[PDB]
Amino acid sequence: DNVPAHEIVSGAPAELSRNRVVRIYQQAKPATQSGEYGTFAWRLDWDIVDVANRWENDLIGWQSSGDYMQATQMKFTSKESAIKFANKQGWDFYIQEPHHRKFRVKQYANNFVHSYGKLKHIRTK
Amino acid sequence: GEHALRRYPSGEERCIACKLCEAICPALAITIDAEERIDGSRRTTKYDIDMTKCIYC
Amino acid sequence: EEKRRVVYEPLELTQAFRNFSAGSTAWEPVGPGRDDRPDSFKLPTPK
Amino acid sequence: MSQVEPGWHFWLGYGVDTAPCNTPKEKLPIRAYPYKFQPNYTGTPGAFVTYNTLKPKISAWEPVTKQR
Amino acid sequence: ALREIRFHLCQNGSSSAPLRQFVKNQIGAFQKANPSTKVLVREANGVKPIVFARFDHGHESKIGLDVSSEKEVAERVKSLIE
Amino acid sequence: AEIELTIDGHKVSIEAGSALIQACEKAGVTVPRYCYHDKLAIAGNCRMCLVDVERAPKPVASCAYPVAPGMVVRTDTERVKQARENVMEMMLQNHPLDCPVCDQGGECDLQDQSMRYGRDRGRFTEITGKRSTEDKNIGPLVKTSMNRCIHCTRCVRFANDIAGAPELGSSGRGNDMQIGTYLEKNLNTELSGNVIDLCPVGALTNKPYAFRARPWELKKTESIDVMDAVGSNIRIDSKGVEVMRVIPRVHEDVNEEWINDKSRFACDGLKTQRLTTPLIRVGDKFVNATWDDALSTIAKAYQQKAPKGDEFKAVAGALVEVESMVALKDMTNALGSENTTTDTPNGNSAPAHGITFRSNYLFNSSIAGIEDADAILLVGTNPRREAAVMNARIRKAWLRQELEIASVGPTLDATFDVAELGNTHADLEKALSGEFGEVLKNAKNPLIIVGSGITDREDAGAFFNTIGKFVESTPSVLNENWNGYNVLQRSASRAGAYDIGFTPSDEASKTTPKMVWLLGADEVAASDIPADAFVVYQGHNGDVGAQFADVVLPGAAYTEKAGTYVNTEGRSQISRAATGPPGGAREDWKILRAVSEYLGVALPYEDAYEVRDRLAEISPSLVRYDLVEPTVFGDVAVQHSLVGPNGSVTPSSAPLTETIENFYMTDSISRSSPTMAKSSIAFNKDNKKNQAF
Amino acid sequence: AIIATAFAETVKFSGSKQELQKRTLALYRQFLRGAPTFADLYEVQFSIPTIRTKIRQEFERHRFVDDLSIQNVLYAKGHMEYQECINFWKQQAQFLKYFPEEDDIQGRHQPSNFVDKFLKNRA
Amino acid sequence: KSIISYNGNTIEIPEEYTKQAPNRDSTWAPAQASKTEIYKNNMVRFEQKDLSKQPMPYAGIELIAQQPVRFVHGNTAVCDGANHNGPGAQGHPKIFINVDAPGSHACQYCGTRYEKE
Numbered sequence A: 001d002n003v004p005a006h007e008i009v010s011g012a013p014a015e016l017s018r019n020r021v022v023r024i025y026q027q028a029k030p031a032t033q034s035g036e037y038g039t040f041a042w043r044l045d046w047d048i049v050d051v052a053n054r055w056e057n058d059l060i061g062w063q064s065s066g067d068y069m070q071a072t073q074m075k076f077t078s079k080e081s082a083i084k085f086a087n088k089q090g091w092d093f094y095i096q097e098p099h100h101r102k103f104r105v106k107q108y109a110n111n112f113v114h115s116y117g118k119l120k121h122i123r124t125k
Numbered sequence B: 001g002e003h004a005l006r007r008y009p010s011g012e013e014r015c016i017a018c019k020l021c022e023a024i025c026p027a028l029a030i031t032i033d034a035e036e037r038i039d040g041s042r043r044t045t046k047y048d049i050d051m052t053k054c055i056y057c
Numbered sequence C: 001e002e003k004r005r006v007v008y009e010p011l012e013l014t015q016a017f018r019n020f021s022a023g024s025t026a027w028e029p030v031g032p033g034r035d036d037r038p039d040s041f042k043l044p045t046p047k
Numbered sequence D: 001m002s003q004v005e006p007g008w009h010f011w012l013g014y015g016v017d018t019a020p021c022n023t024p025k026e027k028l029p030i031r032a033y034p035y036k037f038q039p040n041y042t043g044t045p046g047a048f049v050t051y052n053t054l055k056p057k058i059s060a061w062e063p064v065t066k067q068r
Numbered sequence E: 001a002l003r004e005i006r007f008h009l010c011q012n013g014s015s016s017a018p019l020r021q022f023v024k025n026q027i028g029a030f031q032k033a034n035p036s037t038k039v040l041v042r043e044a045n046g047v048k049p050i051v052f053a054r055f056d057h058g059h060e061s062k063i064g065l066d067v068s069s070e071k072e073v074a075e076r077v078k079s080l081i082e
Numbered sequence F: 001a002e003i004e005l006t007i008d009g010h011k012v013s014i015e016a017g018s019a020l021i022q023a024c025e026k027a028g029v030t031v032p033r034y035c036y037h038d039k040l041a042i043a044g045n046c047r048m049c050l051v052d053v054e055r056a057p058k059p060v061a062s063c064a065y066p067v068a069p070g071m072v073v074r075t076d077t078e079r080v081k082q083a084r085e086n087v088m089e090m091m092l093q094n095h096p097l098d099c100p101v102c103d104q105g106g107e108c109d110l111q112d113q114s115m116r117y118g119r120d121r122g123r124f125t126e127i128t129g130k131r132s133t134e135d136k137n138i139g140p141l142v143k144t145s146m147n148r149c150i151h152c153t154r155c156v157r158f159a160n161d162i163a164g165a166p167e168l169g170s171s172g173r174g175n176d177m178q179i180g181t182y183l184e185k186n187l188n189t190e191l192s193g194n195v196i197d198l199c200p201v202g203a204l205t206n207k208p209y210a211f212r213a214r215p216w217e218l219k220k221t222e223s224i225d226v227m228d229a230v231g232s233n234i235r236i237d238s239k240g241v242e243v244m245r246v247i248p249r250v251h252e253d254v255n256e257e258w259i260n261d262k263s264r265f266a267c268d269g270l271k272t273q274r275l276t277t278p279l280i281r282v283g284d285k286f287v288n289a290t291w292d293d294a295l296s297t298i299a300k301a302y303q304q305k306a307p308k309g310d311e312f313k314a315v316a317g318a319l320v321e322v323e324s325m326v327a328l329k330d331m332t333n334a335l336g337s338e339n340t341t342t343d344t345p346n347g348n349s350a351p352a353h354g355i356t357f358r359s360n361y362l363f364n365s366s367i368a369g370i371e372d373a374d375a376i377l378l379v380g381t382n383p384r385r386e387a388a389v390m391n392a393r394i395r396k397a398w399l400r401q402e403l404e405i406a407s408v409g410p411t412l413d414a415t416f417d418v419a420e421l422g423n424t425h426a427d428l429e430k431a432l433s434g435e436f437g438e439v440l441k442n443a444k445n446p447l448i449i450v451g452s453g454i455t456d457r458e459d460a461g462a463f464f465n466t467i468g469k470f471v472e473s474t475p476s477v478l479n480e481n482w483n484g485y486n487v488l489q490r491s492a493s494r495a496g497a498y499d500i501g502f503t504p505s506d507e508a509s510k511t512t513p514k515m516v517w518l519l520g521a522d523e524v525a526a527s528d529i530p531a532d533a534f535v536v537y538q539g540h541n542g543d544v545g546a547q548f549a550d551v552v553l554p555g556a557a558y559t560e561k562a563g564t565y566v567n568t569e570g571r572s573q574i575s576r577a578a579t580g581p582p583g584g585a586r587e588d589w590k591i592l593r594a595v596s597e598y599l600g601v602a603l604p605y606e607d608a609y610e611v612r613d614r615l616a617e618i619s620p621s622l623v624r625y626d627l628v629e630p631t632v633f634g635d636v637a638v639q640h641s642l643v644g645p646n647g648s649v650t651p652s653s654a655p656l657t658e659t660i661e662n663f664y665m666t667d668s669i670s671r672s673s674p675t676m677a678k679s680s681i682a683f684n685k686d687n688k689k690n691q692a693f
Numbered sequence G: 001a002i003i004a005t006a007f008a009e010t011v012k013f014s015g016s017k018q019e020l021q022k023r024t025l026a027l028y029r030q031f032l033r034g035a036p037t038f039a040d041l042y043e044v045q046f047s048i049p050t051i052r053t054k055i056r057q058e059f060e061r062h063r064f065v066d067d068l069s070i071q072n073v074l075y076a077k078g079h080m081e082y083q084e085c086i087n088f089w090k091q092q093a094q095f096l097k098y099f100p101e102e103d104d105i106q107g108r109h110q111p112s113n114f115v116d117k118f119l120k121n122r123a
Numbered sequence H: 001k002s003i004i005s006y007n008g009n010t011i012e013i014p015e016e017y018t019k020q021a022p023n024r025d026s027t028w029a030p031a032q033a034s035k036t037e038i039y040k041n042n043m044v045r046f047e048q049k050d051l052s053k054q055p056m057p058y059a060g061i062e063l064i065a066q067q068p069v070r071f072v073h074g075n076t077a078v079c080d081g082a083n084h085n086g087p088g089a090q091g092h093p094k095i096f097i098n099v100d101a102p103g104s105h106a107c108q109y110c111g112t113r114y115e116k117e
């Protein structure tokens, strides 16, 4: 199922496959934009490490880091491919299943439906 | 050659922290921070260039 | 200095790599294009 | 070479034809501050000391006790 | 137990049916029998019926409740409580 | 039923009556737009979405053209492209040249679609110049630069329809049409922060976040909000060591695409008043100290105090995660104590609704269940404050179908018409035996909403008894296809606490503790702590709880650790750490594990996977994430917990009061935020900026 | 033409495990034989028995790898390393990477249980 | 003048070098570190160093605050900050400022203040 340690032929540090957890997901539809072009690929990136994520240099005020994977992120065409890759490397992962908008029928004419009782609210346009 | 930040004739800075310079820099030399100045202007509170990363492009 | 030789150590950066690829476009940029296939290499349509 | 005033530095490099003293008033920068020329101070106590212009990102709590 | 009992069981599973019955019928009887113990029933689809008892100073014990009858569930529980 | 049509040669099948743009979206064809949005009424004023349909002579608005059988749609005709260019040309004519200074820049739809569909250059060079627009002050949360408004009316549509705040609207006519209030009035609603996301251009912008970053330099992390108990899904944008902003991400079964203003703007409380080093009280002052020194001081206080059994009390606050609660409860049990209390009033005693079955303290109808409601009775609860997005959900349900809402409890300002049946338990008896009880009996999908504020009353037994009797009688309220009984928690951690049995024992409530351990626990008063008690505080911000302590330990905040939170639905959700804890702060369950080792009761787990294993041991539904499964014990639970043991309780004559006095400041984080402080004093009822008349 | 260099072996993936173990043992013998040459070349402080011990540990690390292709790759990389060492292509700096234990004690505090790891934020 | 350090010892700094700028005493942005704090945190690197040589440029906030308000007839003031003497485009992008509201309205790029009269 999962490649153990020390028969990975990549040469990466053992710590990568021992005490690091990656996460696989699809990017969420950004709330700020209506475009959806970034949401189809399956990203893979590493969960952060507490001590080594980022600190502030005491000279010019920069963001120092000891985590060599903080900037790395792979793109895959499909969830199964990402799973296969992570398994072949021996990475512990978690899958975050995507959420989608539930379909509902929208009619422009619905803005002008006659109301037989009291108006619940004044639509304004 | 070396870098310098300019002013308007009135002496107000010209940099408005738009951070395009930060985004284009091929050596990632530039580090910028910003926030609303007390008079409401959009200005930088930190603008660093690492002259040992810069490629003077 | 203690060992008098060039030693290898885990990576530690003074400034961390800032990946600005997060700002990729949210709109498909180019589209489908057009096909330049010669007519002698496209399957025929019946009738 | 750092002691050459700016503007003369450009003239001496064949940047411009007309020397700074011969340039019209229109093509002179307007300044709202006093102009001061300072050469390269490296190797002296006047060398530039860099620093972070921002206070720390996260501000710690000022401890205060209350009585039960 | 003295202090805590926990019931794990599937909602739709067939192997949990005696557990569902034991809970549904004698959960009140069990509670009144042990008025100081705290009883929890927690359900999830993939899990196999198990029970956990917590006696004192954090000591806990568990038995599997893959059982045929509501009776047999009851004696498994009683054997845990002892 | 579902009808058929062709879009750009493809074959797409869609429900009849849907808009053409829904069909295009389903068929994988991209259509530009501005004014259209999935959660808002259809407007059709931007004219960006034009397409050609063979029947129509002229191009048609895709967001508002209903689909019909056999329709043929082309989104790629030369006429369509020329149309998009023309529309963009006209859109940008008066748009200000503000991109370097606009906060939207880099994530602006006007930019992206001008770049994708507009012309490379412009034709408008008029010596008279462009139009300009006054700026309008609508409160301390949403900064306005109205030159950039493209008049999409998303802000108006949302403020009117979704949040029920009708002060926003469009005044004037033609070129001088201005979005605003026509006079100085705040956009006063707890959902106001969402017009920031809805406005496609930078006209409406986050004010506390203004000018602080650009989208391309932000690290985006998907996590879980903990301000309320709804469990909204959010995206945390951070650069380096500090968190910049919080924006919603879609989860159609929890918050839809919205979050309330507290969840959005209390992020600024995470970078001030923080706890960074252990503190030890010496005299009347705290002194900084090392982790070893702190923990050894706790151990020495434990050996000197010598607590027996329930003399070691543990209190859990509104914000803590499940793993930390589990650690704390296990350690306290291993000390021989059962005094694992919650922070709420009367939290020294066990809750009146019981703990045995989950359906006793959850939103048994899912949050999505509100969509089906035909009648709702609110008992001692104000959802507008306790769960804002759920209030919006109830509002949407009420607008689009007939629905009867009545409430018992304080007179509440609601976004929907409610019937007030009284402020008292006697009024509840009258109602449940009266006309609204009859309405519930007849209803097809009824649901009864009980506030968590009632559980905190001493007479909670009487209310739970009355409600349980009514439920056990009426089959519509509780049958095998629909559970209408619902408890609405307000704190993100109450559901998880009840799930693990973080409930005091009967004999524990009698004892007077000699040592108290506050985990969060910032609702504590002077009264609930004995003077002689040795108090340990563990948290992330400096608040009253830390003021009460003898030793303070810094713990991580919800943005700095990957924890489990259980919302009102009983849904178990996992968060992700955006940044690392500041200073010398630590992960909470690690803190508990280490202190337990100093106490000689060393916990059996020292690794996150072992923590998840212990969680699976406590309950199997903590490890199943994003899953809701109904209870098979619906009928048993009501009888065994609500009507059974609550017979003896005597109802008081005290009227029901509001659970939370101030919506904006309810937590340590929220009380540490300058923005919430400013918002609270800006959005006060007695301020004319928030009146209308 | 471009001819191979000293101690170069053409890349060949063994079709059978046994034919691979023959080569593997040959390579191990070559490493053991070369140990004194390595000790002379790289001016090491430590002893030849320690070189040989290190080699044995390196060969031990993959003693239970099953799939044949992975064994082929490991053998090829091991030979590339041997050729790198024996031809003095490597310098002392890269050679001593193999030998992290013979450097002195790095400090007083190398945490082992949860409390010492926790005190240093490495728990 | 006298800043106490984290050590508990005293650091003496001339008054002129505690000012944030030659023309302004106090900070002009919440996140901006004051000179007092700069010295308190970096005093090791400031030893035996001559402060009068350090850059100390003028604070532009006051310089723009000294510029008089421009009065305009209509409802919109147009500003581009151009240099009428030199060639090319040397200003900032041309924007239009609405002045119907009471008081002065600042150019978003250059800070020049306009008012309707």
Ligand code: SF4
Residues within 6 Å of the ligand: B014, B015, B016, B017, B018, B019, B020, B021, B022, B032, F100
């Ligand atoms: S942030 Fe950079 S690009 Fe933008 S105005 Fe300032 S110096 Fe120029």
Ligand code: SF4
Residues within 6 Å of the ligand: F095, F096, F097, F098, F099, F100, F102, F103, F104, F105, F106, F108, F109, F110, F111, F148, F200, F201, F202, F203
């Ligand atoms: S709203 Fe968009 S197009 Fe307009 S100035 Fe801002 S970033 Fe540019």
Ligand code: SF4
Residues within 6 Å of the ligand: F148, F149, F150, F151, F152, F153, F154, F155, F156, F179, F198, F199, F200, F201, F203, F204
């Ligand atoms: S302010 Fe934004 S959302 Fe409102 S009309 Fe203008 S562009 Fe549309």
Ligand code: FES
Residues within 6 Å of the ligand: F032, F033, F034, F035, F036, F043, F044, F045, F046, F047, F048, F049, F050, F061, F062, F063, F064
């Ligand atoms: S999106 Fe259809 S006309 Fe605006």
Ligand SMILES: [Zn+2]
Residues within 6 Å of the ligand: H079, H080, H081, H092, H107, H108, H109, H110, H111, H112
């Ligand atoms: Zn200007």
